Every structure is written in C-alpha cells, then in structure tokens.
Design a protein around this ligand. Structure first.
Ligand SMILES: *[C@@H]1O[C@H](CO[C@@H]2O[C@@H](C)[C@@H](O)[C@@H](O)[C@@H]2O)[C@@H](O[C@@H]2O[C@H](CO)[C@@H](O)[C@H](O)[C@H]2NC(C)=O)[C@H](O)[C@H]1NC(C)=O
Ligand SMILES: *[C@@H]1O[C@H](CO[C@H]2O[C@@H](C)[C@@H](O)[C@@H](O)[C@@H]2O)[C@@H](O[C@@H]2O[C@H](CO)[C@@H](O)[C@H](O)[C@H]2NC(C)=O)[C@H](O)[C@H]1NC(C)=O
Ligand SMILES: *[C@H]1O[C@H](COC2O[C@@H](C)[C@@H](O)[C@@H](O)[C@@H]2O)[C@@H](O[C@@H]2O[C@H](CO)[C@@H](O)[C@H](O)[C@H]2NC(C)=O)[C@H](O)[C@H]1NC(C)=O
Ligand SMILES: CN(C[C@@H]1CCCN(Cc2ccccc2)C1)S(=O)(=O)c1ccc2ccccc2c1
Ligand SMILES: CN(C[C@@H]1CCCN(Cc2ccccc2)C1)S(=O)(=O)c1ccc2ccccc2c1
Ligand SMILES: *[C@@H]1O[C@H](CO)[C@@H](O[C@@H]2O[C@H](CO)[C@@H](O)[C@H](O)[C@H]2NC(C)=O)[C@H](O)[C@H]1NC(C)=O
Ligand SMILES: *[C@@H]1O[C@H](CO)[C@@H](O[C@@H]2O[C@H](CO)[C@@H](O)[C@H](O)[C@H]2NC(C)=O)[C@H](O)[C@H]1NC(C)=O
Ligand SMILES: *[C@@H]1O[C@H](CO)[C@@H](O[C@H]2O[C@H](CO)[C@@H](O)[C@H](O)[C@H]2NC(C)=O)[C@H](O)[C@H]1NC(C)=O
Ligand SMILES: *[C@@H]1O[C@H](CO[C@@H]2O[C@@H](C)[C@@H](O)[C@@H](O)[C@@H]2O)[C@@H](O)[C@H](O)[C@H]1NC(C)=O
Ligand SMILES: *C1O[C@H](CO)[C@@H](O)[C@H](O)[C@H]1NC(C)=O
Ligand SMILES: *[C@@H]1O[C@H](CO)[C@@H](O)[C@H](O)[C@H]1NC(C)=O
Ligand SMILES: *[C@@H]1O[C@H](CO)[C@@H](O)[C@H](O)[C@H]1NC(C)=O
Ligand SMILES: *[C@@H]1O[C@H](CO)[C@@H](O)[C@H](O)[C@H]1NC(C)=O
Ligand SMILES: *[C@@H]1O[C@H](CO)[C@@H](O)[C@H](O)[C@H]1NC(C)=O
Ligand SMILES: *[C@@H]1O[C@H](CO)[C@@H](O)[C@H](O)[C@H]1NC(C)=O
Ligand SMILES: *[C@@H]1O[C@H](CO)[C@@H](O)[C@H](O)[C@H]1NC(C)=O
Ligand SMILES: *[C@H]1O[C@H](CO)[C@@H](O)[C@H](O)[C@H]1NC(C)=O
Ligand SMILES: C[C@@H]1O[C@H](O)[C@@H](O)[C@H](O)[C@@H]1O
Lengths: 525, 527
C-alpha cells in the first residue's frame, strides 16, 4: 500500500504479527545524504521526489566502528549494525497498526551506543509488536555517530557539533509534517531511548528547537547529567585537533582542517577516533554532545537548575547491574568466560581503569564506601562492588538526580527499577541484569511464544509494553484490577516502582546511601 | 567470440573454466613498442595502432634474464624460471575478467619480483583467474625489463637514463587507465600489489609523481624501497654501467658511443657480464636496479618519505617468518637444501662475511652477539636459525616495519601482517621454514583448487587472504566479514599492531621483532 508524504509517495509492507497485520515502512529518507561538502554539517532538508520510494527494506546504517572483541558471540554481535555501513544513512522507519488508525499516539525510538555506534534496524528495536498489541505508531531513525556526527568546532557551520542531535531533530520534524498521512497524531508523540538514546531524549527536553516536536519523554538507563554524556568545549577542541593530527589534516585554519577532513576516507576517520583521548576508559565517548550555542544554548546543568526546559511528564529508570557490561571491556581479572572473582588489588586496578585522573585519596574513598560488606566471607564481594561503582556513578545516581530536579518544577515523573534477568541472556550469570537488556522487554519480543522466553517473561513484557504505551497515550504509566498503581516520583518521598516477574513493589529512595557519595563527597576529591 | 576494442586496436581472448564458472582471459596484450635496436635502454615508447585483431590467447615472451640453474630438475628453484621464450620484445600484459562481464570492477595489478634481474608475469603462481573468479576483481599483470636492459643508467642521458623497467610498469598502468573500462573495470579503483622487488617497485610508485594518478592503493609483500638491496646511489649505478662497457669492449670517450656500442652487443653478451660489475657481491646483489634518475625518482627515496612527499593513500604491508633462509643455500658455507644444515659458530662467522662483505670485524662481532643470546644452549640448530634471521631481519622484515611506521605517521591507514604458514607442498627442506616468496600462491588462491592436493586448512587460509586482499582493494580495509572474524587493526607507530596469518590462530600482536630490529635501525648504521 502507498502513502503520500509531503516530499513524494512511499510504498510499505504488510507484516503478519500475532494473527493480525502491521504495516511497515522501513527506510524512508528524511534528509539529504550528508556526503561530500555536507560531511560534518547539519542535516539538509529533503526536496520532493517524483517516483515512489520503496520503504521496503531497512536502509544503510551510519558509519561506525564495530565491536569485534568476541568474534562469534551473540551478546556482543547483536549490537553491531545489520545493514551496510554508509554515510548515506539518514533514514527512518514507521510501523502502523492494521487496520489503519486515525489518531494513534506515536512512540519515537532513539537508539544508544555511546554516541559512537548504533542503528535503528536492530532486532531488539523491532516496533511491529508495539503497533500490533497497543495500536501505537512506532518510529525510529538513524542519526550520525562518532566524529561524523559530533565533531565540533564551535561557531563554524562547517562542523558545528551536535550534528547527530539535529539528525534526530529533523526526523522528529518529519513526524510532525507527515505522521497524519499515516494515521498518527502529531500532538501525541512520546520520545523513548536507552543509554545515549536516553541522554539524547533528555537533551531534547532542554533544546528549544525541539520543544514543539514531541509531547512526553521516556529515559531508559541514561540522562544528560551522566558523566559520559556531554563533552566540554575545551575537550571537544582538543579532540578535534587530535583527529586532525592523526589523519594528516592539521592546518593553520579551522576551515582548511575540515576541508582536509572532508577528503579522508571514512575509515580513516573511524579508525582514528580511538586515539583522540589520551586516557580513555570503557565508557569513553570520543565525540559526543557539546555546548554548541545552537542545539544547547547553554550548559545542560544550568538549564536544568534554572528550569529552562520543556515542562511535561517523564518516565525514567535504570537496571540493577548497569555496570557489569563495561567490566569485561578493560578491567583486569574480568572475563565473560569465567566467574571473574577478583581481589582487593584487582579491585584497585579496576578503579584505575575507570577513574584515571582521580587522586590516590579519591580512589581510596570509593573503595572504602563500597566495602562495608554485609557478609565479609563472600569471595565475589569485590566483583560486585566494582560493577556497582561503575553502575552507580555512570547510570543510577545521575538518573535519580535528574528525576529529582526535573520533578521539582511541577512535572509528573515516574521512576522504575528493572531487576529481571533475561532467561536467554548470552552473557554469564555474574553480570546479572545488564545495561541494555530491558530493551527486548520494552519492545515486546517475549510475546513471541515460539521464542525461547519463559511464560513469566511474556507476562512481564506484556505489562511493561502496556505501561509504556499508556504513558504515551495518557501521561501516566498505568495498567489494567490486579495491578500495582505506579506513584509519582517526588523529591521528598522518592517513590519508585520495581519491575520483575515475582512481585512489583513500590519502594523509596533507591540506593540513596551509595548515591550520597557520588553527589556529596566525590565532587570534592 | 571474445573481443574487446582497445584504444590501439581490437583484442581477442579466451574462456577459462574455474570452479564451475567462467573467467575471460586476455594473455599477452602489447602495451608498448618492442624495445628493440635503437630503443634498447630507452624508456618505453607508446604503442601505435594495429588494424588486425590481436590474438591475446597465449602468454608472451619473457624479458631477457639469466636463469637460475643451481638445482636442475628441482621444482623449488625452477618454478621461478621463465616459462615462456626469452626475447627483448617482451612488453606485454595479461588481463583476467570475471564472467559475466562486470560493470565497474576493482582492478588488482601484479608486479612480480626477482631481484630486478629476473621474473615474468606468466608464472603459474601469478595466475589471476582464481581471484577474478572468486572475488570478481579484474587482475592485470605486465612484463617489465630486468637486469641491465631494464636498469642500466647514465643519469640525465635519454639514451640510457635509468629506471626503464619502472617506466615499463608505469606505461602498463597508463594502459589500465586508458583501456580498462572497456573490459568492465573501474580505472578509479586500482590497487597495485607485488612481492619482493615487485613490492619495492610498488612503494616507488607511491613516491613517483608520474604514478600518482595511475592507481588507488598499494600492497607490499616482502619488500619496500628502504630495504638495503633496493636502490642504488646515482653514481654507483653510473660506475657499474662503465664497468659493463669495459667488460664488453665498449669503453668509449663519450657516453653516447658507449650506448651505441652496447646496443650492438648480443643480449647474451650483456647478461653474461652483469654479475661482474660489482666488485664483491652477496646472494642479494642487485647488479642493475632502481637508481635516482632525476625523472622517476627526483631524490633519494628516504628523503621523499621523510618529507611526506608521496601519494597519500592506504597501504597493506607484511613479511614472512623465514625471509632469509632461501638465500643461505646460495652461497653460505655449510648450507645445503639436501641436509639439515647444522652449522658451527665459525661457519656462522663465515656466513656473515658472505652477506656483509664490507663490514668491519667489530661490526660482524656485534651482529653475532645480538643474535646469540640463546634460550637453550643446544639446540644444535641455534647458529643455523640465527643466520637465517640475521639475513631475514636486515633485508626484509626491519625495513618493511620501518617503511610502515614512517608512512603511517603522515595520516593514512596502514595494515601490517606476519605470514607464518609453511606450505604443505613446499619443495624445500623443513629447516628453511616459511620462505621468501611462498605466500604468493596463497594470495592468488592456488589452494582453492581442490584437485591440487593442498590441505583443507590451506584452502580456508587462502580463501581468507584472497578475501582480505580484495576487500582491501575495494574498500581500503582488509576485513573478511563483520562477524566471526578477527579485526585487522591499523598499524600505528605507537602500538604497532599487526595480524598474524596461519592455520592455527590469527592473532593481533604488537612490535614485531622489535628487539632484533632495534639493532639494525639504531646500532648497525653506526658501525
Ligand atoms: C589471429 O588468429 C586468426 C585466426 O583465428 C582463428 O579464427 C578466428 C576467427 C577465431 O575463430 C580464432 O579462435 C581462431 O583461432 C588469424 O586469422 C585470419 O582470418 C582467418 C580466420 O579464421 C584465417 O583463416 C586466416 O588465415 C587469418 N589470416 C591470415 C593472414 O593468416 C589472425 O591473422 C591472427 N592474428 C595475428 C595478428 O596473427
Ligand atoms: C566462525 O568462524 C570460525 C573461524 O575461526 C576464525 O577465523 C579466523 C581467521 C579469525 O578471524 C577468528 O577470530 C575466527 O574465529 C569457524 O571456525 C573453526 O571451525 C572449524 C570448522 O568449521 C574448525 O576446524 C576450527 O578448529 C575452528 N576454529 C576455531 C573455533 O578457532 C567457526 O566454525 C565459525 N562458527 C560460526 C558459529 O559461524
Ligand atoms: C666505481 O667502481 C670501480 C670498480 O671497478 C672495476 O673494474 C670493473 C671492470 C669491474 O670488473 C669491477 O669488478 C672492478 O671493481 C671502482 O674502481 C676500483 O679501483 C680500481 C680501478 O680499476 C679497481 O682495480 C678496483 O678493483 C676497484 N675497487 C674495488 C674495491 O674493487 C671505483 O672506485 C668506483 N667509484 C668511482 C667513483 O668510480
Ligand atoms: C565503544 N563502546 C563499546 C562498548 C563497550 C561496552 C558496551 N558495549 C556494548 C554492550 C555490550 C554488552 C552489553 C551491552 C552493551 C560496547 S560504545 O561506543 O558502544 C559505548 C561507549 C561509551 C558508552 C558510555 C555510556 C554508555 C554506553 C556507551 C557505549
Ligand atoms: C640473482 N638472484 C637469484 C636468486 C638467488 C636467491 C633467490 N633465488 C630465487 C628464489 C629461490 C628460492 C626461493 C625464493 C626465491 C634466485 S635474483 O636475481 O633472482 C635476486 C637478486 C636479489 C634479490 C634481492 C631480494 C629478493 C630477491 C632477489 C632475487
Ligand atoms: C589535549 O591533547 C593533547 C595532545 O595529545 C594531550 O597531550 C599529552 O598529555 C599527556 C599527559 O596525559 C602527555 O604524556 C603527552 O606527552 C602530551 N602530548 C602532547 C603532544 O602534548 C593532552 O593531554 C590533552 N588534554 C586534555 C585535557 O584532553
Ligand atoms: C568490509 O568493510 C567495509 C568497510 O570498510 C564494508 O564496506 C561498505 O561496503 C558496502 C558493500 O557491501 C558498500 O555498499 C558501502 O558503501 C561500504 N561503505 C564503506 C564506508 O566502506 C564492506 O561491506 C565489508 N565487507 C565484508 C564482507 O564484511
Ligand atoms: C565506476 O565508479 C566510479 C567511482 O569509483 C564512478 O565515478 C563517479 O564518482 C566519481 C568519484 O571519483 C566522480 O568522478 C563522479 O561523481 C562519478 N563519475 C562519473 C559520473 O563519470 C564511475 O562513474 C563508475 N562507472 C560505472 C558505474 O560505470
Ligand atoms: C530457540 O531454541 C531453539 C532450539 O535450541 C537451542 O538451545 C541450545 C540447546 C542450543 O542448541 C542453542 O543453539 C539453541 O538456541 C533454536 O533452534 C531457536 O533458534 C531458538 N530461538 C531463539 C530466538 O533463540
Ligand atoms: C488509565 O488510563 C487513563 C488515564 O488515567 C484512564 O482513563 C483509565 O481509566 C486508567 N485506567 C486504570 C486501570 O487506571
Ligand atoms: C495486506 O496486503 C494488501 C496489499 O495491497 C494491503 O492493502 C492490506 O493491508 C492487506 N490485505 C488485506 C487486509 O486484505
Ligand atoms: C518499487 O517497488 C515495487 C514493488 O514491487 C517494484 O516492483 C519496483 O520495481 C520498485 N521501483 C523502484 C524505483 O523502487
Ligand atoms: C487527535 O486527532 C484528531 C484528528 O482529527 C485531532 O482533531 C485532535 O486535535 C488530536 N488531538 C488530541 C489531543 O487528541
Ligand atoms: C584559511 O586559510 C586559507 C589558506 O589559504 C585561506 O584561503 C582562507 O581564506 C582562510 N580563512 C580564514 C577565515 O582565515
Ligand atoms: C578469568 O579470565 C581472565 C582472562 O582469561 C584471566 O586473566 C583471569 O585471571 C581469570 N579469572 C579467573 C578467576 O579464572
Ligand atoms: C565464452 O563464454 C560465454 C559465457 O560463458 C559463452 O556463452 C561462450 O560460448 C564462450 N565462447 C567461446 C568459448 O568461444
Ligand atoms: C651438506 O651440505 C654440503 C654438501 O655438499 C656440505 O658442505 C655440508 O657440510 C653438508 N652438511 C651436512 C652433511 O651436515
Ligand atoms: C594519545 C595522544 O594524545 C596526544 C596527541 O598528541 C596524540 O594525537 C595522541 O592521540
């Protein structure tokens, strides 16, 4: 079937999903290909095509380095791109219930990947189950990553920074001018994302240019106040100049540096992004969002303190073991192929890798705060402490803090704590409930019963799916009789809802004792 | 009928059956006027036009060269000898195209080695049909003049200017530019690859401005221009020209009468005297090779490299594990191919005299000292392997590593490999190991042919190297697949990472033989 968009018509596909049908448009272009003289610039709006575009296959994924630490391993390769890499990559995808709705709420997914990786066409981001089961329209877009998306020379329209954020913004504009032709409501659109996708979503809360382009926001395992999320203009200029040296592109002038960089083979940009930082860590974001004076008119924390942001409802959460995924990408003694029992010395060496610039006194204080063992017998105490150090500092504690400050402006906020470990998880049991492994429950993958999930995992996925869709439609993540009511998160009581197969409780002040260190003592070492 | 219209006339080819498919082969296409008579020792003259159909259906003549007859009937030495007739009329190229015809194929151009004194593009180990068949690339190779007929030099004299063999290669590259679209090839996707003096040739095309528009990317197997054997100083070349004139009764008062005299000599009278132009030579002597001619090379190549004056593109470089052992059975005391060549410390010292004729007694002692820190004192094999490694490190491995460092410092992606697999069909004894030149049959896919008695592990290894080489040419990155494959990382002068190639495990490693090479880069030049 065909739909006419404001720049031409596109042809879709019929998908048979759970005894019904979902109509899919995969690979709609939404911007001019950022090639040649457009490399490093903001995305240019598309002009009309006379033929009919066939949105029938997923499009090219944006240029990016590939995780090849574990050749053959599903737990790492499931995140790698599954279409061809190319600078020609500004495409989005649209999934629509059948029969065609007339004012369906739209959910727009922004993937993560540390701003360096990612693509909207991963299996775990398949929006067909969401459209089928809750009658929402699901949209996802490819946006530029690494230096091709976030190389910054502040002030210069040739390489201004945040280009990948503007990609996302141009996709949200596309939805405003086209989703009605598909049966969707441009006045009921909810952004959701994970990790850098979540951080991206929260930056759309701040940027005035994005204010009118969506309604509500969902932030899975990420926010802009996380330590990895924003590069200083200082650091970004140091890194741009380092990439210039590593590629042979050091000039005396900004515009000649980018003229030279625009002539490099993409793989000569890609394969040098790793060296622009002298002391990276497994959480390094070589090229990420900056204070560009355009997307971010100021520095996000001031915008958040002063209350200069879109006022709306938010849904925010974290997983139980955010930290463990990064331990096997650098920390000594850790492996996916053994139980990774480490000593206090190895723990001290892992703190070095994750906190390279921290004084010996500060690293001792991290150690001390995380070693008040409730059972000082357990060999795996140190292995768990290091994962909790990384997870609390990089994900959990910033998410709580963001929700506190955002709520204190008269906004309904809801917070969740995801504790279910997937029965299919390819990684070892010690990594627990990992970063990224709630996504397949949010997208409804366990509802497919020919897939080796458990029954409880189907029941859990179905409620998360329902609650997310309800928050999109109504602004409150409610479910149907025998269902826990989700209370608002408020600064004083700090109530959050737990998610797991056993019992979903309501709790207060998540990990408050851990996070007191990262907010109130660590900033002073 | 199989007919392509080239800018000099029409050519007719032949169909080949490879792995249940077809490869169109044009063998023996001329690319230059035959360098006969008054054209002896001059740069190649561009071709005119013929009206017939040229039949490009057999390999052409090999250029004149002495043959290696050290081991009559020995496949090991004789597989390198020319397999077509010898003649001064030898400037022909071959083209292998995948069937069905491609529309914009990437082109790989092979430049053979052979000490700049031997070699031919028609050898069985250089057969491009497998690569065309399996990776859908066009494969071109050319014959270029070797020995004094290719590299005799009186610098600045157009009658014998130097580097003619290199201009031959260049003229063939110009042919690919002008003509290869007609065959289905993309002139804008051209990768040069070559081995030994073919690899030193490839690296010189990166330095030579006249070559810069004739290719895209470069692959260097077991050689580069900074190797000690690869380039003669301008006046050492001019001196050898006059010794050859003297050895043939062509000494004259002016250079052009010398050349006029040499031009009337029989090719064999010239070949017969090429060995004698060097006072003392090693098994790695290049009597007549590249020199600084003021045309193809406008300075000593080490200067141009250091100053960043070379083509900025991606390179793939590597070496074999036992580069040196081949040269020990060609002059060193105690070494035979027919016994296990256990030698003594005194035989080792005589070995060094053979390969380092002009080095002081202290210099030869320091080389010995650096290479005798045994892990096990006996190990009867210690001194035998030390000598092979001395020869291998100084002539191939350490210069390839140094060229890759320096080249990569100017901002392009480089990729280094260490080839460690001994061919199961290698006719040479086991003590010689992974020899010089014995990765070539794996680069061209000869193990993919199952009727040929390779192991199946060698088919998987050759299949992988073929894929990485072709992907490098197409994409500038020698990747195999995205999943289930060791990533080949860029070679950077800090970490200096390389990929090992063998049947057991391809590993990412660092600082290949740095403890050895530090001697040759930082102590031996002070000796
Ligand atoms: C190149 O070869 C042809 C002969 O080719 C044969 O015929 C071709 C048409 C084709 O079928 C090939 O596969 C065959 O091998 C030479 O031929 C001239 O014309 C006819 C062709 O059959 C032949 O009977 C004549 O005798 C040939 N002319 C002469 C003067 O002998 C052609 O000359 C060859 N080209 C060169 C440069 O030698
Ligand atoms: C995945 O591919 C491997 C190939 O092994 C490798 O290739 C190397 C060059 C390097 O890239 C390395 O990282 C990569 O793993 C297949 O391998 C092997 O399987 C054969 C049988 O088919 C055995 O004979 C080998 O011993 C075995 N080698 C190993 C495991 O190292 C493997 O079958 C394939 N698996 C899947 C699921 O695709
Ligand atoms: C250039 O090379 C000369 C080499 O001369 C030789 O005579 C040739 C015919 C040839 O057979 C070769 O084997 C001979 O070495 C250098 O001249 C040298 O000095 C003497 C002069 O005839 C000669 O007897 C020596 O044998 C030779 N030197 C050595 C070490 O063998 C000449 O010095 C070189 N340099 C220049 C600038 O000409
Ligand atoms: C280069 N990075 C590679 C990462 C290393 C660890 C994560 N894996 C993915 C992964 C594996 C297993 C389970 C879940 C996820 C790959 S990254 O570009 O992907 C990256 C960088 C910094 C980030 C900082 C904050 C959050 C995410 C980041 C991701
Ligand atoms: C006069 N040379 C004859 C050689 C001597 C040793 C090599 N064999 C060939 C051979 C045998 C076995 C395995 C591989 C190769 C014959 S040469 O002109 O061919 C020559 C000269 C100098 C070179 C310097 C660098 C590399 C190769 C050289 C070849
Ligand atoms: C900015 O970039 C420069 C360029 O690399 C970095 O410089 C190095 O700093 C380390 C100390 O960590 C020294 O060991 C090196 O010798 C320095 N190299 C050069 C060329 O100066 C610098 O650290 C970077 N700074 C920041 C804050 O990013
Ligand atoms: C090997 O890696 C290269 C990346 O360097 C891949 O290249 C892309 O390849 C596709 C062809 O399938 C092209 O359409 C894209 O335009 C290429 N883009 C870039 C930036 O190179 C290549 O596909 C990989 N091949 C394999 C077999 O994995
Ligand atoms: C074969 O591929 C080349 C690119 O490698 C095509 O050339 C295009 O890109 C060139 C970049 O070097 C530019 O010059 C042009 O944009 C374009 N060239 C043209 C239109 O002639 C080339 O056309 C391809 N030929 C085919 C597909 O037949
Ligand atoms: C679900 O499981 C099916 C059967 O297989 C497996 O479990 C173990 C024993 C291994 O053999 C493993 O390879 C299999 O997963 C699979 O055929 C099917 O593909 C699986 N589907 C998913 C989505 O995992
Ligand atoms: C939740 O959805 C909307 C928004 O509050 C409301 O109309 C509906 O009755 C609610 N249902 C439940 C079960 O809370
Ligand atoms: C699936 O296919 C057709 C193709 O035109 C599409 O129009 C429709 O949504 C589906 N067909 C039905 C429902 O009969
Ligand atoms: C568009 O899609 C239709 C679907 O069958 C296909 O037949 C047609 O060839 C396609 N054409 C273009 C230009 O995409
Ligand atoms: C929903 O869609 C209808 C479609 O006509 C529109 O009139 C209405 O304003 C939209 N807004 C809301 C809040 O439902
Ligand atoms: C930057 O340098 C180049 C070098 O010639 C020059 O042409 C250009 O005008 C310069 N631009 C500015 C803004 O200085
Ligand atoms: C786990 O594996 C890593 C890497 O193989 C190793 O360094 C570490 O010591 C191992 N630990 C245990 C407890 O086996
Ligand atoms: C050449 O190959 C083509 C394609 O396979 C084939 O149709 C034709 O018969 C062949 N011509 C010959 C062998 O003369
Ligand atoms: C083998 O090589 C030659 C044989 O001609 C000889 O000089 C050498 O001593 C022999 N070595 C042995 C038999 O170990
Ligand atoms: C690690 C180093 O940091 C510093 C820079 O000078 C280099 O580019 C390199 O990246």
């Amino acid at each position: 079937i065909i739909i006419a968009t404001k720049n031409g018509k596109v042809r879709g596909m019929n998908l048979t999903v759970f005894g019904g049908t979902v109509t899919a448009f995969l690979g709609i272009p939404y911007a001019q290909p950022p090639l040649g003289r457009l490399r490093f610039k903001k995305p240019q709006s598309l002009t009309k095509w006379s033929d009919i575009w066939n949105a029938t296959k997923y499009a090219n994924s944006c240029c990016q380095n590939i995780d090849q630490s574990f050749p053959g391993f599903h737990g790492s390769e499931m995140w790698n791109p599954n279409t061809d890499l190319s600078e020609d990559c500004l495409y989005l995808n649209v999934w629509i219930p059948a029969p065609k709705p007339k004012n369906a709420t739209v959910l727009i997914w922004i993937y993560g990947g540390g701003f360096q990786t990612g693509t909207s066409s991963l299996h775990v981001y398949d929006g067909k189950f969401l459209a089928r089961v809750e009658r929402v329209i699901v949209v996802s877009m490819n946006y530029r990553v690494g230096a091709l998306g976030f190389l910054a020379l502040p002030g210069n329209p040739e390489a201004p920074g945040n280009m990948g954020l503007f990609d996302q913004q141009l996709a949200l504009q596309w939805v405003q001018k086209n989703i009605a032709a598909f049966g969707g409501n441009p006045k009921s659109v909810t952004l959701f994302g994970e990790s850098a996708g979540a951080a991206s979503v929260s930056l759309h809360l701040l940027s005035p240019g994005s204010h009118s382009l969506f309604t509500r926001a969902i932030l899975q395992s990420g926010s802009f106040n996380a330590p990895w999320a924003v590069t200083s203009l200082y650091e970004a200029r140091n890194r741009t100049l380092n990439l210039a040296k590593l590629t042979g592109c050091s000039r005396e002038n900004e515009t000649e540096i980018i003229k030279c960089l625009r002539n490099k083979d993409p793989q000569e940009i890609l394969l040098n992004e790793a060296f622009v930082v002298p002391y990276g860590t497994p959480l390094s974001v070589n090229f990420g969002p900056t204070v560009d004076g355009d997307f971010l008119t100021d520095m996000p924390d001031i915008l958040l303190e002063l209350g200069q942001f879109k006022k709306t409802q938010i849904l925010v959460g974290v997983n139980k073991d955010e930290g463990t995924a990064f331990l096997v990408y650098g920390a000594p003694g850790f492996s996916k192929d053994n139980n990774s029992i480490i000593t206090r010395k190895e723990f001290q060496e892992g703190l070095k890798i994750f906190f390279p610039g921290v004084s010996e006194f500060g690293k001792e204080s991290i150690l001390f705060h995380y070693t008040d063992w409730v059972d000082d017998q357990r060999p795996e105490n140190y292995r768990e402490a290091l994962g909790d150090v990384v997870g609390d500092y990089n994900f959990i504690c910033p998410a709580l803090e963001f929700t506190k400050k955002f709520s204190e402006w008269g906004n309904n906020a809801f917070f969740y704590y995801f504790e279910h470990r997937s029965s299919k998880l390819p990684w070892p049991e010690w990594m627990g409930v990992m970063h990224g492994y709630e996504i397949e429950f949010v997208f409804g993958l366990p509802l497919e019963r020919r897939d080796n999930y458990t029954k409880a995992e189907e029941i859990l996925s179905r409620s998360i799916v329902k609650r997310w869709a309800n928050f999109a439609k109504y602004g409150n993540p409610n479910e149907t009789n025998n269902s826990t009511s989700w209370p608002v998160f408020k600064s004083t009581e700090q109530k959050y809802l737990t998610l797991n197969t056993e019992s979903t409780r309501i709790m207060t002040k998540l990990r408050a004792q851990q996070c007191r260190f990262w907010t109130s003592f660590f900033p002073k070492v």
